Design a binder for these strands. Structure first.
Length: 304
RNA sequence: GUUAAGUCUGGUUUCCCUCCAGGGUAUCUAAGCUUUGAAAAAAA
C-alpha cells in the first residue's frame, strides 16, 4: 500500500548531463522508482524494445514521491529555479496566497521558500571525487578523475510512494535495493496506509513530473498561466533503460513541486489520441502524472 | 713554760645564634617556507 524507501547512505540521482561535480536531484524521478521496482520483480523472459511496456507489466499504478522525515511529511514546492521542501500545513493557504496582492505575494512566498523551507535542515550536498588507479603503476590512471554531488541526509529520511496492487507489496517488504546512481543502497518497507483519491479541487500539487504529449506543446506553452500557477516547466530525459542500455526519451514536463490549476486536467484529457493516450497511460501507470490536493493528503492521476 | 710542725682548697655554671632578605628585572619566540609536480573527462 504505502512504500517507504529509506536510503542507508548518501544517494545520487544524476540529472542534466555530466559535462564542478555532477549534481543530484532532491526527489528521484518516478522512472527511477519504477526501474528499481521492476528490477526487483524482473523475470528474464518478458523482454521487448519498449522499456515501459515490460515495466508496466511487472507492477501496477505507482503514486508520486514525497518526503517523510520523522513522522512529518515534506513535499516539494518550486517557484521557478527554487526548490524547497515544505510541510503541507503551509500549502493550505497557498492558492489564497497565489492571486493575493503583490507585496503580500512576495512576502509570503519568500517566507515559504526561505524560512519555512526545511530543505537544508534535511539535505546536505556532499561532493565526492573519485579516481581510478592502474594496478601496476599504483599511480592515478590517466584521465580517470570523476566528481559527483551526492545527496546526503542530515536526519533520517524516507521517500514515500503509494502502490495500488497489494500482491507485489508482499515481495517488496524488507528488500535491500540498489536505489539510484553509482551503486548506492536503500531499504524498502511496506505498510498499510490510508490515502484518499481523486478530489475535485482547483489547485493541485505536482508530486511527480506531469508529462506533456509533445503535440500540445505549443498549445500548452503559448498560454502557460492557464494551467500552472507556480512551478517550473522543463525538458527532462526519462532516464536510462537497463535492457537496451540507452537513454529513454525526452519530454517536456511540469517538474514535481509545481502548482497546477484544475484546468490542466481537462486540457490533458482533450489532447491525446488513442495511441499516445495508451502511451501516456503507461507513463502514468509507472508514476509520472501524480497530483495531490493542497487541502489534504489525497492523490489522483490525471488520466487514470 | 719550752720546743717542733704547718695542713686543706687550685674554675665552675649559663649563653652556641636571633631577625630581615629566599630572588627581582628584560627577553616569552623571530624570519622563512603556507603546498608543488602528475593525474580533467576515461573505455562499454
Amino acid at each position: 500500500k504505502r512504500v517507504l524507501i529509506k536510503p542507508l547512505e548518501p544517494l545520487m540521482f544524476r540529472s542534466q548531463g555530466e559535462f564542478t561535480a555532477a549534481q543530484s536531484l532532491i526527489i528521484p524521478r518516478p522512472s527511477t522508482i519504477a526501474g528499481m521496482l521492476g528490477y526487483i520483480l524482473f523475470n528474464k523472459s518478458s523482454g521487448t524494445g519498449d522499456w515501459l511496456s515490460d515495466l508496466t507489466n511487472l507492477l501496477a499504478t505507482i503514486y508520486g514521491t514525497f518526503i517523510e522525515t520523522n513522522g512529518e511529511y515534506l513535499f516539494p514546492l518550486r517557484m521557478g529555479n527554487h526548490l524547497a521542501l515544505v510541510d503541507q500545513q503551509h500549502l493550505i493557504n497557498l492558492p489564497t496566497l497565489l492571486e493575493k496582492e503583490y507585496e503580500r505575494r512576495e512576502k509570503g512566498i519568500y517566507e515559504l521558500f526561505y524560512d519555512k523551507n526545511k530543505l537544508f535542515q534535511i539535505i546536505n550536498h556532499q561532493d565526492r571525487i573519485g579516481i581510478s588507479i592502474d594496478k601496476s603503476t599504483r599511480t592515478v590512471k590517466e584521465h580517470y578523475l570523476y566528481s559527483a554531488r551526492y545527496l546526503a541526509f542530515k536526519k533520517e529520511v524516507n521517500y514515500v510512494i503509494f502502490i495500488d496492487n497489494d500482491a507485489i507489496s508482499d515481495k517488496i517488504n524488507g528488500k535491500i535495493v540498489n536505489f539510484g546512481g553509482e551503486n548506492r543502497i536503500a531499504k524498502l518497507e511496506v505498510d498499510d496506509y490510508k490515502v484518499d483519491t481523486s478530489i475535485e479541487e482547483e489547485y493541485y500539487l505536482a508530486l511527480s513530473p506531469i508529462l506533456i504529449p509533445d503535440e500540445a506543446l505549443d498549445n500548452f506553452l503559448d498560454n502557460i498561466s492557464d494551467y500552472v500557477a507556480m512551478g517550473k516547466v522543463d525538458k527532462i530525459s526519462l532516464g536510462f533503460d537497463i535492457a537496451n542500455t540507452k537513454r529513454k526519451e525526452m519530454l517536456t514536463a511540469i517538474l514535481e513541486g509545481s502548482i497546477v490549476k484544475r484546468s490542466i486536467i481537462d486540457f490533458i484529457k482533450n489532447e491525446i489520441k488513442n495511441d499516445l493516450r495508451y502511451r501516456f497511460s503507461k507513463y502514468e501507470k509507472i508514476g509520472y502524472n501524480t497530483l495531490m490536493s493542497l487541502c489534504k493528503l489525497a492523490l489522483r492521476k490525471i488520466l487514470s
